[PDB]
């Protein structure tokens, strides 16, 4: 209604872009309710370029106590950029939110293309998953490659850009480690994308942003994950016994080369998983499902991409549903909050 | 069980040729990593060839490398082993095995053999 | 190369003894040992798979211990056809062949 005003105001605005503050963004709908806050599309007054804001809201940072989460999500994905991971442009706030605005994606997001394909369809076609499969994995290779334990990865954050290339996006929960430590304990990332050392509250290495690379697999082909139904997420008590307990089994629809290299990744014992051999994380790159993509190519972004999106026609959801928590009622921000929100901005 | 049944057995000159099947049941062959092992009479067990599960890459022992090549049919569900250049070595009964998955896979072992096919290199 | 060693070469036992033997390779193949029983008119057969797992449809009796370059198999309990070569197994390669031990022989003390 609105929303489709507000859709029409962004295709118009697309149209104008193909051929830091409250006074230097227009607005158009939000895409989802994140973690901390609204995350909606935004265009820039002197350039007319498409960003995205990922809108952390202060009112909802403020119930949920989301300030450490916040800072670590920044600094990192900040720091750390590829070709696989896209740059973070501006870091400011408003009054009612922290923004982070970050680098064109205007392909909408993997989650988004499994059920816009069609819902009936599950996922993609097999080389066309492929080809994204043996991009995320050279993106994660590249975290690796730095000694960075993500402790994340989900569809949501494998974005496609407008030639059809994916590239992870937003680093969220994580830490970046030298080279003299590669075991930290914590109870970090966002359920289900986690692996069963770090809810089990122990040590882990690599080997568990190789368990997320797993689910995310799985998702992306099979249309469901193997710890989550069609469209659907569990509670995190209940996903933690899924990661922990459930058994994948693995539909017709993958080929064999992926169901071989779905397993290898979805190994309960870090042991077992596929990823950091103590040697090499080169042995994944061995696996058949890779006979189909040169790795020097790929690397270098010389492939061409099965599909292309379509620049006729807008990703990502409009408004009709979207998540929501606590927005403030007597409670009252306090002076470190303020002091965050400032510190936050860049 | 899973079981295979080799045929193909029998005297064949030194230097000759000689081609074994091993006819598989209990599984998909697409669906299966095949090998090749031997063992010479009395004596332990060497490992001659293995072949992917939806067939692509092949490794050898460097013995019997080049010599002797692997090859499937999954129209058929049965391995065969081409064997060329016979030796006084090579006089052995020959087993095939299966392998599940390739590259870490529930970290596999050799599961189910044969129960052998003579081959007898002389002359 | 891979150079697999067992120890003891040969031992003497006796029937519902504790035999335990060890095997040893010459560099790091990771935590992937099996173990297979060998023993006259029969194939090889799988006894232990992965590390120390009990394949299915073989008796208890076998267990495997241990991890890094070192592995053991221990038969708990002998039964009069445990008089056997017992060989280790590594089954990984680079393209290098998948290497057997040279067989720890069994045999009835007498």
């Known amino acids: 209604l609105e929303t489709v005003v507000a859709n029409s105001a962004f295709i118009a605005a697309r149209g104008s872009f193909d051929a830091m503050g409250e006074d230097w963004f227009l607005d158009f709908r939000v895409l989802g309710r994140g973690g901390f806050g609204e995350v909606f599309a935004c265009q820039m007054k002197a350039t007319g370029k498409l960003y995205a804001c990922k809108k952390l809201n202060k009112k909802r940072l403020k119930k949920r106590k989301g300030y450490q989460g916040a800072m670590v999500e920044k600094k990192i994905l900040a720091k750390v950029h590829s070709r696989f991971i896209v740059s973070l442009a501006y870091a400011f706030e408003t009054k009612t939110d922290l923004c982070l605005v970050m680098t064109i994606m205007n392909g909408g997001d993997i989650r988004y293309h499994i059920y816009n394909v069609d819902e009936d369809n599950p996922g993609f076609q097999e080389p066309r998953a492929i080809f994204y499969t043996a991009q995320i994995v050279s993106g994660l290779e590249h975290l690796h490659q730095r000694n960075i334990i993500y402790r994340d990865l989900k569809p949501e954050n494998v974005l496609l850009d407008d030639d059809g290339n994916v590239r992870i996006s937003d680093l969220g929960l994580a830490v970046e480690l030298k080279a003299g430590q590669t075991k930290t304990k914590g109870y970090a990332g966002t359920p289900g994308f986690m692996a069963p050392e770090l809810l089990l509250g122990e040590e882990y290495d690599f080997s568990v942003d190789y368990f997320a690379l797993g689910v995310t697999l799985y998702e992306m082909i099979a249309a469901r994950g193997p710890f989550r139904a069609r469209g659907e997420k569990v509670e995190n008590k209940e996903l933690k016994q899924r990661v922990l307990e459930q058994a994948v089994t693995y539909p017709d629809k993958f080929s064999p080369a992926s169901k071989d290299f779905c397993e290898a990744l979805l190994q309960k014992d870090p042991e077992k998983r596929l990823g950091f051999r103590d040697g090499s994380c080169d042995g994944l790159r061995t696996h058949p499902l890779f006979r189909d993509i040169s790795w020097r190519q790929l690397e270098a972004g010389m492939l061409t991409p099965p599909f292309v999106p379509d620049s006729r026609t807008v990703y990502a959801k409009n408004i009709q549903d979207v998540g929501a928590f606590e927005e403030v009622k007597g409670v009252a921000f306090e002076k470190a909050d303020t002091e965050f929100f400032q510190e936050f901005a860049s | 069980e899973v079981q295979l049944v080799e045929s193909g057995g029998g005297l064949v000159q030194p230097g000759g040729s000689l081609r074994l099947s091993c006819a598989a049941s209990g599984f998909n062959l697409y669906s299966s990593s095949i090998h090749w092992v031997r063992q010479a009479p009395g004596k332990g067990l060497e490992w001659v060839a293995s072949?992917?599960?939806?067939?692509?890459?092949?490794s050898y022992a460097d013995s019997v490398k080049g010599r002797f090549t692997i090859s499937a049919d999954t129209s058929k569900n049965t391995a065969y082993l081409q064997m060329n250049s016979l030796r006084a070595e090579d006089t052995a009964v020959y087993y095939c095995?299966?392998?599940?998955?390739?590259?870490?896979?529930?970290?596999?072992?050799?599961?189910?053999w044969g129960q052998g096919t003579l081959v007898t290199v002389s002359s | 190369d891979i150079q697999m060693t067992q120890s003891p070469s040969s031992l003497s036992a006796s029937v519902g003894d504790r035999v335990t033997i060890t095997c040893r390779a010459s560099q790091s193949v990771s935590s992937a040992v099996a173990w297979y029983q060998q023993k006259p008119g029969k194939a090889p057969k799988l006894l232990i798979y992965?590390?120390?797992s009990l394949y299915s449809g073989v008796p208890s009796r076998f267990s495997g211990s241990r991890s890094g370059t070192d592995f053991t198999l221990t038969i708990s309990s002998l039964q009069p056809e445990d008089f056997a070569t017992y060989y280790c197994?590594?089954?990984?390669?680079?393209?290098?062949?998948?290497?057997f031990g040279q067989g720890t022989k069994v045999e009835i003390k007498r």
């Open positions: 197994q590594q089954y990984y390669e680079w393209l290098s062949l998948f290497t």
């Open positions: 992965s590390a120390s």
């Open positions: 095995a299966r392998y599940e998955g390739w590259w870490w896979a529930n970290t596999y072992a050799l599961d189910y």
């Open positions: 072949i992917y599960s939806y067939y692509g890459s092949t």
